[PDB]
Amino acid sequence: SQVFGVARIFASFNDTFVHVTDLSGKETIARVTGGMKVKADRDESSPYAAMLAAQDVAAKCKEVGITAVHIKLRATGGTKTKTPGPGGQSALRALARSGLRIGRIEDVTPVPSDSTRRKGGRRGRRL
RNA sequence: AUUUUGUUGGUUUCUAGGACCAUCGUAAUGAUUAAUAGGGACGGUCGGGGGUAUCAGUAUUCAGUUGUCAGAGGUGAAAUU
Numbered sequence: 001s002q003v004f005g006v007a008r009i010f011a012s013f014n015d016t017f018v019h020v021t022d023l024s025g026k027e028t029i030a031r032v033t034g035g036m037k038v039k040a041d042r043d044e045s046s047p048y049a050a051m052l053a054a055q056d057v058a059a060k061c062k063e064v065g066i067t068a069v070h071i072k073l074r075a076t077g078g079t080k081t082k083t084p085g086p087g088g089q090s091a092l093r094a095l096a097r098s099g100l101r102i103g104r105i106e107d108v109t110p111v112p113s114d115s116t117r118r119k120g121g122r123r124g125r126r127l
Numbered sequence: 128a129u130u131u132u133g134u135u136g137g138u139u140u141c142u143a144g145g146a147c148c149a150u151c152g153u154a155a156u157g158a159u160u161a162a163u164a165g166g167g168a169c170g171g172u173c174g175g176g177g178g179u180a181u182c183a184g185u186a187u188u189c190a191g192u193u194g195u196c197a198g199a200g201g202u203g204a205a206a207u208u
């Protein structure tokens with residue numbers, strides 16, 4: 001039927017990565033980040049930039065032959081926050097609305113079975 | 128050592144007295160509860176109680192292979208990087 005890639009979307013709170021690989025993930029097809037679409041650091045992770053980033057990925061996917069993708073959304077993970085950034089929701093909707101077909105969707109955020117120490121100190125970040 | 132042998136040392140038998148030792152007989156012969164105190168034993172347990180080894184788990188960082196290409200990071204915004 002369709003030809004599947006894998007859209008590995010890494011959505012932090014400072015930027016948004018839209019990265020499409022092959023099934024193995026060892027071959028990169030298109031990687032457009034929200035920071036390549038704006039010149040202000042404060043909105044590298046904006047929903048608007050993520051939508052533009054996804055459209056460039058979808059356009060690149062079409063000329064290589066990728067007609068469908070599986071979605072593996074992730075947050076920063078590790079010792080830091082596990083909730084996805086604001087751009088992850090926009091990049092997913094933009095991909096679906098760009099004529100690309102959507103397969104399986106999974107959250108693959110790095111979660112610890114314990115945890116190393118997290119930055120900020122004992123008293124947290126005082127603002 | 129309490130008396131007397133006419134009498135003082137007497138003298139050790141003697142008399143009597145505790146104090147014990149044995150036998151026999153008397154006797155209803157002789158040991159308070161087990162504290163909704165405690166201690167101990169025992170029986171099935173119950174615990175992220177302790178110690179010594181041992182086996183996971185992803186994560187973090189670093190490294191090796193790869194893959195593409197212009198930003199990535201970070202913030203309230205930036206900059207150092």
Ligand SMILES: [Mg+2]
Nearest residue numbers: 014015041044
């Ligand atoms: Mg940023």
Ligand SMILES: [Mg+2]
Nearest residue numbers: 035036038039
């Ligand atoms: Mg830029």
Ligand SMILES: [Mg+2]
Nearest residue numbers: 038039040198
């Ligand atoms: Mg610049």
Ligand SMILES: [Mg+2]
Nearest residue numbers: 117118119120
């Ligand atoms: Mg540090």
Ligand SMILES: [Mg+2]
Nearest residue numbers: 124125126127
């Ligand atoms: Mg405050």
Ligand SMILES: [Mg+2]
Nearest residue numbers: 131132133134
């Ligand atoms: Mg006389």
Ligand SMILES: [Mg+2]
Nearest residue numbers: 161162164165
């Ligand atoms: Mg008792």
Ligand SMILES: [Mg+2]
Nearest residue numbers: 169170171172
């Ligand atoms: Mg026992």
Ligand SMILES: [Mg+2]
Nearest residue numbers: 109110111185
């Ligand atoms: Mg996992």
Ligand SMILES: [Mg+2]
Nearest residue numbers: 039197198199
């Ligand atoms: Mg520059």
Ligand SMILES: [Mg+2]
Nearest residue numbers: 014015044200
């Ligand atoms: Mg950035």
